[PDB]
Design a protein around this nucleic acid. Structure first.
Length: 57
DNA sequence: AGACTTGTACTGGAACTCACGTGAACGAATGTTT
């Protein structure tokens, strides 16, 4: 997703911008899902934008 | 916005075919030897 933005249609209080599926993980169990704490940490890490680090070459 | 599906056009390689070249083999004539 491009970023995480506030919303009122979802329980987490936030929704993704431009979401798309990259892979249906057949190796991850259901209990390995993200947690609200991790989502809050990711949201606060870079002001909601999911692109933080710098391209290198 | 983004991602996939469908339609059009193009280019390169596979396959097939013909032309040309090279290699080996041979019956008959001629020359040489006995």
């Amino acid at each position: 997703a491009a970023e995480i933005v506030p919303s009122d249609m979802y329980k987490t209080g936030c929704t993704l911008r431009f979401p798309r599926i990259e892979k249906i993980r057949d190796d991850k169990e259901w209990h390995e899902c993200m947690t609200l704490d991790d989502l809050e940490q990711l949201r606060g890490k870079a002001s909601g934008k999911l692109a933080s680090k710098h391209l290198y070459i």
